[PDB]
Design an enzyme around this catalytic site. Sequence first.
Site, mmCIF file in Angstrom:
data_model
loop_
_atom_site.group_PDB
_atom_site.id
_atom_site.type_symbol
_atom_site.label_atom_id
_atom_site.label_comp_id
_atom_site.label_asym_id
_atom_site.label_seq_id
_atom_site.Cartn_x
_atom_site.Cartn_y
_atom_site.Cartn_z
ATOM 1 N N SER A 1 -4.004 -5.833 0.753
ATOM 2 C CA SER A 1 -4.440 -6.854 1.595
ATOM 3 C C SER A 1 -5.596 -7.355 1.521
ATOM 4 O O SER A 1 -5.887 -8.521 1.620
ATOM 5 C CB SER A 1 -4.157 -6.287 3.116
ATOM 6 N N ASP B 1 -9.250 -2.318 -18.400
ATOM 7 C CA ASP B 1 -10.407 -1.605 -17.911
ATOM 8 C C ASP B 1 -9.819 -0.730 -16.745
ATOM 9 O O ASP B 1 -10.830 0.034 -15.998
ATOM 10 C CB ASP B 1 -11.497 -2.817 -17.540
ATOM 11 N N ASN C 1 0.874 -1.024 0.029
ATOM 12 C CA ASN C 1 -0.064 0.169 0.001
ATOM 13 C C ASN C 1 1.098 1.195 0.018
ATOM 14 O O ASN C 1 0.452 2.213 0.561
ATOM 15 C CB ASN C 1 -0.874 0.132 1.301
#
Length: 279
Positions: free
Chosen positions: A224, A260, A161
């Site tokens: 996560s 996408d 992250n």
Amino acid sequence: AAQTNAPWGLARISSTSPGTSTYYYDESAGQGSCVYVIDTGIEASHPEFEGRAQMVKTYYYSSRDGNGHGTHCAGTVGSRTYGVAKKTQLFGVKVLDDNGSGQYSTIIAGMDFVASDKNNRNCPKGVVASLSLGGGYSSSVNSAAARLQSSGVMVAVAAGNNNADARNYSPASEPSVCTVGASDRYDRRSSFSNYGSVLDIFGPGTDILSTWIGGSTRSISGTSMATPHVAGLAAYLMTLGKTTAASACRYIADTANKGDLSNIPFGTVNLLAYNNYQA
């Protein structure tokens, strides 16, 4: 099968388009597969697991999930409401304390545990490990994830992250495992999600509703949380016979929704995990 008013992540992994709310999946639902959740543990007594979750290993004074992180990811793997593989067996490996933290050696030992413990379990359809953890680079952690993968376990790991290249993170940077990035309900790369060439696939990572400790539910963000989507998908696909542990990550990428996602850095795959289920 069709689960109405499903969490957006479940609906997305069964959809060519964003913005839907029904999760479509073959009713086999990952039965006969096993997913190891290497995390803070699993509150197995949560009604959402229906007796399919159990703690198999801890390195701490308790195997209980005093954090909720591992319960949340196990719920995304295979809880009845919030899970991808609603009939898979969930095995908790508590390598993180209730602060969500853990020494690398413990994480390594927990990964080596799974590679052996799968021979103590009944997983005729295959074994998956969901590693919703990570830190700085470590060849030792990478090699541990590579060994788990080599033992015949589909290893899905979070990219991290850090909004950075995942090459500087372990086990995200281990080439042989499945490094999972996070996307949001609008098919944007999650703002926090790591990227780079090592990423294999993106999964729903922002505002993921799933089980929590105390028999509750909550929505939290992170790569996560995208990882158990891909781990549950892998178990789902291995139960369907569409792939094996050694090739699930490659298969998931071959059958993903391409191009996408928005805000995917140049050089990062634009692949969103997709179960390719047709009713």
